[PDB]
Amino acid sequence: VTAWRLFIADHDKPVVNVIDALDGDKLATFNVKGPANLSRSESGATIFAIQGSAGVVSTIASGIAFADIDIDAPKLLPLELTGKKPGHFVERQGKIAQWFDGEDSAQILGESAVLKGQKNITKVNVVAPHHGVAVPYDNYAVVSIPNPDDASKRPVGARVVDLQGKKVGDDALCPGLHGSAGSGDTFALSCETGLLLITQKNAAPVIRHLPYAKTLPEGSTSTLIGGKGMQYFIGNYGPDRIILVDPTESDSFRLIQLPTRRVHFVVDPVRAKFAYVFTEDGKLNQIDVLKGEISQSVRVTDPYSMDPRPRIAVADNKIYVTDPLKSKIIVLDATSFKKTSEISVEGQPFNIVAVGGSGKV
Numbered sequence: 001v002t003a004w005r006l007f008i009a010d011h012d013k014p015v016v017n018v019i020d021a022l023d024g025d026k027l028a029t030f031n032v033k034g035p036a037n038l039s040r041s042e043s044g045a046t047i048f049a050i051q052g053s054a055g056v057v058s059t060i061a062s063g064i065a066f067a068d069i070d071i072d073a074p075k076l077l078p079l080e081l082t083g084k085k086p087g088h089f090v091e092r093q094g095k096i097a098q099w100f101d102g103e104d105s106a107q108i109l110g111e112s113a114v115l116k117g118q119k120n121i122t123k124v125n126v127v128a129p130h131h132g133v134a135v136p137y138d139n140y141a142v143v144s145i146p147n148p149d150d151a152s153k154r155p156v157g158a159r160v161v162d163l164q165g166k167k168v169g170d171d172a173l174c175p176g177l178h179g180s181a182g183s184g185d186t187f188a189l190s191c192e193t194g195l196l197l198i199t200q201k202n203a204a205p206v207i208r209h210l211p212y213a214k215t216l217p218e219g220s221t222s223t224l225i226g227g228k229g230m231q232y233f234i235g236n237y238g239p240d241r242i243i244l245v246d247p248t249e250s251d252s253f254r255l256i257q258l259p260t261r262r263v264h265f266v267v268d269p270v271r272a273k274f275a276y277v278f279t280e281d282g283k284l285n286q287i288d289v290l291k292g293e294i295s296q297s298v299r300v301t302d303p304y305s306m307d308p309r310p311r312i313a314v315a316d317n318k319i320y321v322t323d324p325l326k327s328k329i330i331v332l333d334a335t336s337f338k339k340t341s342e343i344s345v346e347g348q349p350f351n352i353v354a355v356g357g358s359g360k361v
Contacts, residue, residue, distance in 0.1 A: 001358065001359065001361050002316065002356075002358040003020075003064050003069065003071050003356050003357075003358070004022060004064075004354060004355065004357070005018055005019065005021055005062060005063065005074065005315075005354065005355055006018070006315065006352060006354050007038055007060065007353050007354075007355075008038075008329070008345055008349045008351070008352045009349075009351040009352075010347045010348055010349065010350060011307070011308035011324055011348040011350040012035055012348055013035065013347050013348075014033055014034050014035055014036070014054070015030065015031060015347070016030045016032060016036055016038070016047075016058075016060065017030075017345055017349070018030070018060075018074045019329070019343060019345070021315040021318065021356065022316070024331075024341070024343040024344075027063075027073065027074055030049075030058075030060065030074075032049055032051060032058045032076075033051050033054035033058070034051035034052070034053045034056070036049035036050060036051050036058070037049070037052070037089075038351045038352070039089040039091065039353065040062070040353045040354075040355055041094070041096075041111050042092065042094075043066070043111065044062055044355030044356065045061065045065040045111065046061060046062060046077075046115060047061075047062050047074075047353060047355070048060070048096075050086045050087070050089055052085050052086055052087065052101075053085075055084055055085070055086070056081065056086065057080065057081040058077075058080055059076075059077040059079050059080065059114055060074060060075070061077055061115060063075070064357070067357070067358075068359045069358060069360070077114065077117065079114055079117065079118070079119045081109075081121075083105075083107065084100055084101070084103055084129075085100060085102040086098060086099070087101040087131060087132070087133075088132070088133040088180060090134060090135050090136065090180065090182070091111065092137075092182055092187070094110055094111040095111075095136035095138075096109045096110065096111060096114070096136060097124075097135060097136040098134075099126075099132055099133055099134050100129075101129060101131045101132075102129050104126065104128065105123040105125055105165075106123070106124050106126055106134040106141070106143060107121050107122070107124075108122040108124055108134070108136050108141060108163065109121050109122070122163050124141055124143065124161060124163055124164075124165050125161075126143045126144070126146070126165070127145070127146055128146040129146075129151070130146040130153075130155055131154065131155075132146065133177075133180045133189065135180070135187050135189075135198060135205075137198075137200045137204075139162065139163065140160055140161065140163070140168065140205050141163065142159070142161075142187070142189075142198055142205055142207065143158065143159065144157070144158050144177050144189075145157045145177075154177060154178050155177045155178075156173060156176075156177065157172045157173040157177060158172050158177060158198075159171045159172060159207075160205055168204050169204065169207075174192075174193065174196050175192045176191050176192035177190070177191040178190065178191070178223075179191075179221055179222045179224040179235060181224035181225050181226035181233055182226045183227045183228070183232055183233055184226075185199055185200075185231075186199055186231060186247050186248075187199075187226075188226065188233045188247065189224075190221035190222060190224050191220070194209055194210050194211035195209070195221070195233070195235075195245065196208070196209055196210075197210055210245070212243075212253065213252060215253075216255055217237075217238075217241075219237040219238045220237070221236055221237055221243060222236060223235060225265055225266060225267055225275070226267065227267050227272060227275070228267055228268075228272065229269060229272030230273065230289065231247065232244060232245060232246050232247070232289055233245040233247065234265055234289075236262060237255065239261045239262060240258045240259075240260065240261045240262065241255060241256065241257050241258060242256050242258065242262065242277060243256070244256065244287075244289055254292035256287065256293065256294065258277060258279055258285065258294075259279065259281065259283075259297075260279045260280045261280045261306055262277055262278070262279060262280075263278045263304060263306075263309045263310060264278045264309070264310060264311050265278070265312070266312045266313065267289075268334065269314060270314065270316070270317070270334070273289055273290050274286055274287060274288060274295075274334075275289055276314070278300070278309075278310050278311075278321065280303060280304055280305050281299075281303050282299055282304060282310075283297045283298060283299050283300065284300045284312065284319065284321060284332065284337075285297045298337050298339070300321045300330050301323045301326070304325075308348050308350045309324070310322050310323055310324070311350060311351050311352045312352070313353055314334065314354060315354035315355075316356070317333065317334050317335060318331055318332065318333060319332045319333075319334050320332075320343075320352060320354065322345075322349040322350060324347075324349050324350050325348070327346055327348070327349065328343060328344050328345060328349070329343040329345055329349060330342055
């Protein structure tokens, strides 16, 4: 049995739609408190709907878990996280860290408990409310350090804390810290001088700094995605360029110039040599990460000359591009890179995540 599902948040309405990615039919629509940004767990078993303006994070059991596969209907869980302006969500190996821009704490919990209907939260102090990020580790977390002076500015680095908020090592200064992603056993935080790279073995997590290569043009990264199946990061580097970073090689950086400005990007979790960038001209661009170049482009929507704009997700052998102003999802074959289908979604379909796979029953 093969099963994949899309989870789509409306830009304005407090709704999340669940769509069977394979035939387009609707599986559920969930009503939440506010418009949501969506994240999935690594296992794909839970979906989190972050509602910045409503002070809540809702949780969805996706209904697909695992090889052997167990398939149920998707369901809104009664577990909700509460706090002012929920922010960056980071999940790793079933450990969850939910940041709150308006709180003195981040909330750490575990996927296994969430799915069982349990809410077992550890609040870790982050010194001062700010727009930051928490990465969960075994018996530790990495949390951004709020800007001294103001604190409403971007954070100035990160540090290891134990789960009582106590600092462990020394601070890792990274001015203008913004942007985070995991790829394999390595987690990256971007800032004005480069990337913080985080790994954990059997002790405290270890942070090291990778400066932007001296050969790059002036610029820095403020958003990151992480490869799945091959270890790398993709960041923005100015509005019309991206950088590919290999954190395991000394020749770390490759710059790609886009023809027009970036709207969104995602990696391909199935064909790990590829990633995808959507640009304001309305094209989907295939990034061959090994060669460091755009290998092809295809027009998918009308231009969105830089509020809602398309978002990409990948499921099985298909790519899904939300077209909010046209109340639909465009579906392309990943291999041929051609449109094959469209799926209607009422309203302004915006953020999108996909889960699934295959297993015996």
